[PDB]
mmCIF file of C-alpha atoms and ligand atoms in Angstrom:
data_model
loop_
_atom_site.group_PDB
_atom_site.id
_atom_site.type_symbol
_atom_site.label_atom_id
_atom_site.label_comp_id
_atom_site.label_asym_id
_atom_site.label_seq_id
_atom_site.Cartn_x
_atom_site.Cartn_y
_atom_site.Cartn_z
ATOM 1 C CA UNK A 259 30.688 -9.373 0.288
ATOM 2 C CA UNK A 260 30.106 -9.964 4.057
ATOM 3 C CA UNK A 261 28.240 -12.849 5.403
ATOM 4 C CA UNK A 262 27.513 -12.659 8.990
ATOM 5 C CA UNK A 263 27.646 -15.521 11.507
ATOM 6 C CA UNK A 264 24.138 -17.612 11.107
ATOM 7 C CA UNK A 265 23.924 -16.395 7.314
ATOM 8 C CA UNK A 266 23.853 -19.074 4.803
ATOM 9 C CA UNK A 267 24.140 -18.551 1.082
ATOM 10 C CA UNK A 268 23.007 -21.247 -1.521
ATOM 11 C CA UNK A 269 24.391 -22.629 -4.387
ATOM 12 C CA UNK A 270 25.147 -20.360 -7.423
ATOM 13 C CA UNK A 271 24.601 -17.058 -5.559
ATOM 14 C CA UNK A 272 26.762 -14.100 -6.342
ATOM 15 C CA UNK A 273 27.250 -12.003 -3.409
ATOM 16 C CA UNK A 274 28.533 -8.494 -4.850
ATOM 17 C CA UNK A 275 31.411 -6.173 -4.077
ATOM 18 C CA UNK A 276 30.609 -4.326 -0.654
ATOM 19 C CA UNK A 277 27.406 -6.051 -0.226
ATOM 20 C CA UNK A 278 26.284 -7.021 3.572
ATOM 21 C CA UNK A 279 24.140 -10.187 4.187
ATOM 22 C CA UNK A 280 22.878 -9.620 7.977
ATOM 23 C CA UNK A 281 22.636 -12.963 10.294
ATOM 24 C CA UNK A 282 20.203 -13.102 12.771
ATOM 25 C CA UNK A 283 16.615 -11.258 12.354
ATOM 26 C CA UNK A 284 15.839 -8.824 15.089
ATOM 27 C CA UNK A 285 13.765 -9.806 18.143
ATOM 28 C CA UNK A 286 13.537 -12.426 20.600
ATOM 29 C CA UNK A 287 12.825 -15.300 18.498
ATOM 30 C CA UNK A 288 14.583 -13.608 15.669
ATOM 31 C CA UNK A 289 15.584 -16.517 13.216
ATOM 32 C CA UNK A 290 18.911 -16.692 11.189
ATOM 33 C CA UNK A 291 19.064 -15.243 7.532
ATOM 34 C CA UNK A 292 19.073 -17.561 4.571
ATOM 35 C CA UNK A 293 19.825 -16.542 0.954
ATOM 36 C CA UNK A 294 18.814 -19.662 -1.407
ATOM 37 C CA UNK A 295 20.028 -20.721 -4.747
ATOM 38 C CA UNK A 296 21.077 -18.395 -7.715
ATOM 39 C CA UNK A 297 20.409 -15.301 -5.748
ATOM 40 C CA UNK A 298 22.133 -11.978 -7.226
ATOM 41 C CA UNK A 299 23.346 -9.525 -4.456
ATOM 42 C CA UNK A 300 24.357 -6.521 -5.986
ATOM 43 C CA UNK A 301 27.527 -4.401 -4.954
ATOM 44 C CA UNK A 302 26.848 -2.151 -1.946
ATOM 45 C CA UNK A 303 23.601 -3.963 -1.290
ATOM 46 C CA UNK A 304 22.214 -4.763 2.158
ATOM 47 C CA UNK A 305 19.869 -7.995 2.478
ATOM 48 C CA UNK A 306 18.675 -7.914 5.968
ATOM 49 C CA UNK A 307 15.521 -10.699 5.237
ATOM 50 C CA UNK A 308 15.814 -14.220 4.055
ATOM 51 C CA UNK A 309 15.612 -14.734 0.678
ATOM 52 C CA UNK A 310 14.206 -17.987 -1.604
ATOM 53 C CA UNK A 311 15.696 -19.039 -4.729
ATOM 54 C CA UNK A 312 16.299 -16.870 -7.404
ATOM 55 C CA UNK A 313 15.952 -13.595 -5.688
ATOM 56 C CA UNK A 314 17.597 -10.271 -6.910
ATOM 57 C CA UNK A 315 18.670 -7.537 -5.146
ATOM 58 C CA UNK A 316 20.072 -4.252 -7.002
ATOM 59 C CA UNK A 317 23.173 -2.781 -6.305
ATOM 60 C CA UNK A 318 22.801 -0.108 -3.618
ATOM 61 C CA UNK A 319 19.467 -1.395 -2.291
ATOM 62 C CA UNK A 320 18.941 -1.865 1.225
ATOM 63 C CA UNK A 321 16.502 -4.843 2.034
ATOM 64 C CA UNK A 322 15.513 -4.323 5.688
ATOM 65 C CA UNK A 323 12.980 -5.898 7.884
ATOM 66 C CA UNK A 324 11.327 -2.745 8.003
ATOM 67 C CA UNK A 325 11.487 -1.361 4.587
ATOM 68 C CA UNK A 326 8.266 -1.043 2.545
ATOM 69 C CA UNK A 327 8.405 -2.193 -0.997
ATOM 70 C CA UNK A 328 5.346 -1.812 -3.475
ATOM 71 C CA UNK A 329 4.657 -4.906 -5.160
ATOM 72 C CA UNK A 330 4.751 -5.516 -8.817
ATOM 73 C CA UNK A 331 3.960 -8.638 -11.048
ATOM 74 C CA UNK A 332 1.739 -10.131 -8.361
ATOM 75 C CA UNK A 333 0.249 -12.785 -10.793
ATOM 76 C CA UNK A 334 3.651 -14.172 -11.799
ATOM 77 C CA UNK A 335 5.078 -14.108 -7.896
ATOM 78 C CA UNK A 336 2.011 -15.798 -6.785
ATOM 79 C CA UNK A 337 2.376 -18.953 -9.502
ATOM 80 C CA UNK A 338 6.112 -19.171 -7.618
ATOM 81 C CA UNK A 339 4.850 -18.608 -4.314
ATOM 82 C CA UNK A 340 1.625 -20.293 -4.233
ATOM 83 C CA UNK A 341 0.635 -20.159 -0.494
ATOM 84 C CA UNK A 342 1.570 -16.295 -0.040
ATOM 85 C CA UNK A 343 -1.404 -13.927 -0.227
ATOM 86 C CA UNK A 344 -0.730 -10.997 -2.273
ATOM 87 C CA UNK A 345 -3.522 -9.166 -1.740
ATOM 88 C CA UNK A 346 -2.022 -5.959 -0.988
ATOM 89 C CA UNK A 347 0.367 -3.448 -2.240
ATOM 90 C CA UNK A 348 2.723 -2.668 0.011
ATOM 91 C CA UNK A 349 4.859 -5.197 1.795
ATOM 92 C CA UNK A 350 7.288 -4.747 4.891
ATOM 93 C CA UNK A 351 10.676 -6.470 4.125
ATOM 94 C CA UNK A 352 9.870 -9.186 6.736
ATOM 95 C CA UNK A 353 6.763 -10.006 5.486
ATOM 96 C CA UNK A 354 8.167 -11.309 2.319
ATOM 97 C CA UNK A 355 10.942 -13.164 3.534
ATOM 98 C CA UNK A 356 11.700 -16.559 2.207
ATOM 99 C CA UNK A 357 9.921 -15.964 -1.240
ATOM 100 C CA UNK A 358 11.114 -17.180 -4.551
ATOM 101 C CA UNK A 359 11.427 -14.700 -7.702
ATOM 102 C CA UNK A 360 11.948 -11.518 -6.161
ATOM 103 C CA UNK A 361 13.599 -8.760 -7.488
ATOM 104 C CA UNK A 362 14.096 -5.727 -5.106
ATOM 105 C CA UNK A 363 14.743 -2.562 -7.337
ATOM 106 C CA UNK A 364 14.091 1.245 -6.728
ATOM 107 C CA UNK A 365 11.983 3.191 -9.255
ATOM 108 C CA UNK A 366 14.473 5.906 -10.501
ATOM 109 C CA UNK A 367 11.721 8.251 -11.691
ATOM 110 C CA UNK A 368 9.426 7.940 -8.580
ATOM 111 C CA UNK A 369 12.078 7.222 -6.123
ATOM 112 C CA UNK A 370 9.896 4.193 -4.802
ATOM 113 C CA UNK A 371 10.955 0.764 -3.490
ATOM 114 C CA UNK A 372 9.516 -2.007 -5.466
ATOM 115 C CA UNK A 373 9.459 -5.755 -5.302
ATOM 116 C CA UNK A 374 9.076 -7.313 -8.404
ATOM 117 C CA UNK A 375 9.014 -10.470 -10.517
ATOM 118 C CA UNK A 376 12.749 -11.706 -11.633
ATOM 119 C CA UNK A 377 12.091 -12.163 -15.148
ATOM 120 C CA UNK A 378 14.634 -15.113 -15.086
ATOM 121 C CA UNK A 379 12.815 -16.850 -12.096
ATOM 122 C CA UNK A 380 9.879 -17.672 -14.246
ATOM 123 C CA UNK A 381 12.121 -19.837 -16.651
ATOM 124 C CA UNK B 259 -21.992 22.340 -6.922
ATOM 125 C CA UNK B 260 -23.831 19.446 -8.917
ATOM 126 C CA UNK B 261 -25.799 16.815 -7.281
ATOM 127 C CA UNK B 262 -26.570 13.677 -10.017
ATOM 128 C CA UNK B 263 -29.688 11.782 -9.870
ATOM 129 C CA UNK B 264 -29.969 9.436 -6.784
ATOM 130 C CA UNK B 265 -27.364 11.103 -4.814
ATOM 131 C CA UNK B 266 -28.369 12.343 -1.210
ATOM 132 C CA UNK B 267 -26.656 14.879 1.029
ATOM 133 C CA UNK B 268 -27.181 14.777 4.628
ATOM 134 C CA UNK B 269 -27.557 17.842 7.000
ATOM 135 C CA UNK B 270 -25.136 20.437 7.463
ATOM 136 C CA UNK B 271 -22.975 19.346 4.485
ATOM 137 C CA UNK B 272 -21.573 22.422 1.913
ATOM 138 C CA UNK B 273 -20.934 21.059 -1.391
ATOM 139 C CA UNK B 274 -18.408 23.750 -2.765
ATOM 140 C CA UNK B 275 -18.565 25.894 -5.965
ATOM 141 C CA UNK B 276 -18.382 23.505 -8.987
ATOM 142 C CA UNK B 277 -17.804 20.603 -6.791
ATOM 143 C CA UNK B 278 -19.665 17.467 -8.176
ATOM 144 C CA UNK B 279 -21.475 14.456 -6.782
ATOM 145 C CA UNK B 280 -21.897 11.668 -8.611
ATOM 146 C CA UNK B 281 -25.042 9.667 -8.324
ATOM 147 C CA UNK B 282 -24.608 5.642 -8.817
ATOM 148 C CA UNK B 283 -21.753 3.373 -8.376
ATOM 149 C CA UNK B 284 -20.502 1.751 -11.481
ATOM 150 C CA UNK B 285 -21.422 -1.848 -12.373
ATOM 151 C CA UNK B 286 -24.621 -3.839 -12.424
ATOM 152 C CA UNK B 287 -25.707 -3.705 -8.841
ATOM 153 C CA UNK B 288 -23.857 -0.522 -8.648
ATOM 154 C CA UNK B 289 -25.753 1.412 -5.883
ATOM 155 C CA UNK B 290 -26.644 5.134 -4.926
ATOM 156 C CA UNK B 291 -24.018 7.573 -3.717
ATOM 157 C CA UNK B 292 -24.928 8.900 -0.270
ATOM 158 C CA UNK B 293 -23.077 11.676 1.578
ATOM 159 C CA UNK B 294 -23.518 12.029 5.034
ATOM 160 C CA UNK B 295 -24.061 14.788 7.505
ATOM 161 C CA UNK B 296 -21.678 17.952 8.084
ATOM 162 C CA UNK B 297 -19.695 16.651 5.130
ATOM 163 C CA UNK B 298 -17.489 19.428 3.420
ATOM 164 C CA UNK B 299 -16.910 19.188 -0.351
ATOM 165 C CA UNK B 300 -14.225 21.685 -1.692
ATOM 166 C CA UNK B 301 -14.442 23.646 -4.572
ATOM 167 C CA UNK B 302 -13.991 21.695 -7.836
ATOM 168 C CA UNK B 303 -13.765 18.628 -6.009
ATOM 169 C CA UNK B 304 -15.404 15.144 -7.278
ATOM 170 C CA UNK B 305 -17.079 12.717 -4.954
ATOM 171 C CA UNK B 306 -17.527 9.375 -6.592
ATOM 172 C CA UNK B 307 -18.127 7.169 -3.727
ATOM 173 C CA UNK B 308 -20.742 7.141 -0.737
ATOM 174 C CA UNK B 309 -19.257 9.088 1.931
ATOM 175 C CA UNK B 310 -20.229 8.621 5.984
ATOM 176 C CA UNK B 311 -20.651 11.670 8.357
ATOM 177 C CA UNK B 312 -18.187 14.387 8.909
ATOM 178 C CA UNK B 313 -15.919 13.811 5.885
ATOM 179 C CA UNK B 314 -13.978 16.193 3.938
ATOM 180 C CA UNK B 315 -12.839 16.264 0.459
ATOM 181 C CA UNK B 316 -10.457 19.011 -0.279
ATOM 182 C CA UNK B 317 -10.946 21.549 -3.177
ATOM 183 C CA UNK B 318 -9.562 20.014 -6.578
ATOM 184 C CA UNK B 319 -9.718 16.549 -5.133
ATOM 185 C CA UNK B 320 -11.272 13.698 -6.944
ATOM 186 C CA UNK B 321 -12.055 10.874 -5.134
ATOM 187 C CA UNK B 322 -13.143 8.529 -7.829
ATOM 188 C CA UNK B 323 -14.111 4.276 -7.287
ATOM 189 C CA UNK B 324 -10.856 3.314 -8.444
ATOM 190 C CA UNK B 325 -8.521 6.277 -7.010
ATOM 191 C CA UNK B 326 -5.884 4.770 -4.379
ATOM 192 C CA UNK B 327 -5.247 6.072 -1.090
ATOM 193 C CA UNK B 328 -2.429 6.036 1.408
ATOM 194 C CA UNK B 329 -3.992 5.697 4.799
ATOM 195 C CA UNK B 330 -3.281 8.016 7.853
ATOM 196 C CA UNK B 331 -4.178 8.050 11.198
ATOM 197 C CA UNK B 332 -5.523 4.654 11.247
ATOM 198 C CA UNK B 333 -6.052 4.248 15.310
ATOM 199 C CA UNK B 334 -8.468 7.128 15.168
ATOM 200 C CA UNK B 335 -9.948 6.285 12.217
ATOM 201 C CA UNK B 336 -10.773 2.571 13.931
ATOM 202 C CA UNK B 337 -12.366 4.080 16.539
ATOM 203 C CA UNK B 338 -14.941 6.192 14.174
ATOM 204 C CA UNK B 339 -15.330 2.979 12.245
ATOM 205 C CA UNK B 340 -14.978 -0.489 14.451
ATOM 206 C CA UNK B 341 -16.140 -2.755 11.946
ATOM 207 C CA UNK B 342 -13.654 -1.706 9.126
ATOM 208 C CA UNK B 343 -10.395 -3.492 8.912
ATOM 209 C CA UNK B 344 -7.568 -0.629 8.511
ATOM 210 C CA UNK B 345 -4.729 -3.660 8.035
ATOM 211 C CA UNK B 346 -3.328 -2.151 4.743
ATOM 212 C CA UNK B 347 -1.528 1.243 3.737
ATOM 213 C CA UNK B 348 -3.271 1.552 0.499
ATOM 214 C CA UNK B 349 -7.215 1.854 -0.334
ATOM 215 C CA UNK B 350 -8.962 2.429 -3.357
ATOM 216 C CA UNK B 351 -12.075 5.002 -3.183
ATOM 217 C CA UNK B 352 -14.810 2.044 -3.422
ATOM 218 C CA UNK B 353 -13.180 0.230 -0.388
ATOM 219 C CA UNK B 354 -13.680 3.477 1.728
ATOM 220 C CA UNK B 355 -17.400 3.531 0.838
ATOM 221 C CA UNK B 356 -19.676 4.982 3.708
ATOM 222 C CA UNK B 357 -16.969 5.176 6.285
ATOM 223 C CA UNK B 358 -17.043 8.240 8.718
ATOM 224 C CA UNK B 359 -14.311 10.883 9.630
ATOM 225 C CA UNK B 360 -12.377 10.684 6.372
ATOM 226 C CA UNK B 361 -10.263 13.626 4.948
ATOM 227 C CA UNK B 362 -9.415 13.367 1.626
ATOM 228 C CA UNK B 363 -6.334 15.332 0.680
ATOM 229 C CA UNK B 364 -2.976 15.709 -1.665
ATOM 230 C CA UNK B 365 0.302 15.636 0.111
ATOM 231 C CA UNK B 366 1.786 18.497 -1.851
ATOM 232 C CA UNK B 367 5.442 17.498 -1.193
ATOM 233 C CA UNK B 368 5.018 13.806 -2.698
ATOM 234 C CA UNK B 369 2.011 14.153 -4.865
ATOM 235 C CA UNK B 370 0.376 11.199 -3.068
ATOM 236 C CA UNK B 371 -3.345 10.972 -2.584
ATOM 237 C CA UNK B 372 -4.044 10.617 1.210
ATOM 238 C CA UNK B 373 -7.028 9.431 3.304
ATOM 239 C CA UNK B 374 -6.510 10.731 6.690
ATOM 240 C CA UNK B 375 -8.743 11.665 9.583
ATOM 241 C CA UNK B 376 -10.422 14.768 9.727
ATOM 242 C CA UNK B 377 -9.549 16.425 12.965
ATOM 243 C CA UNK B 378 -13.124 17.694 13.965
ATOM 244 C CA UNK B 379 -14.554 14.322 13.625
ATOM 245 C CA UNK B 380 -13.040 12.895 16.767
ATOM 246 C CA UNK B 381 -14.498 15.648 18.661
HETATM 247 CL CL1 CL C 1 32.700 -1.770 1.704
HETATM 248 CL CL1 CL C 2 -17.650 24.269 -12.839
HETATM 249 CL CL1 CL C 3 -1.257 -2.038 1.229
#
């Protein structure tokens, strides 16, 4: 897939067929996008935020700065991300930037965008 | 409708046919339920939390301590409820207790439970 200027992809990551990684976050002090180690970006996905290590974006999913996600697995994600405040239920893409062990997926019954634990990231 | 022991209903309120108002909130320091002035509780609704003034519970809706609601009209609700923090998008019934101008309804297309502005409460 496509790595825009300023975007950095970490060791062991897999950028799937036709995936997009955008380069620079929106705004005036909009910073560069980095994807961490061992991230898996699905075919035809779009990654518009920085991701930490061991994150998964399912095929077809667009993870943009303003996309809202329903958080699942808060207790396990807290362990991988001890400074982050997992107090609420809905987060914008931009709020989740740089976190480790995230799994972005769509609930195929309800249609909701979810941010959950990458089960492999605990181990 | 049905007013349980410890429940108080304020002036000008209308308790619709078969509505339930519960009396005491759950737990050990579980406090009594009060509905404020000019509240409208729909037929066959259930009110399980304290409500402030000018609140509306649509017919058929159950507003329980643990029910989650999607907040709409945050800026206008902030005006009626200046100390409350409308920072997030999803609130449990119990978190919303005692607030003024709330309108509890169901989104009939998405099926989501909503807490919104009672349009009459601004005026
Ligand atoms: Cl393509
Ligand atoms: Cl009845
Ligand atoms: Cl929320």
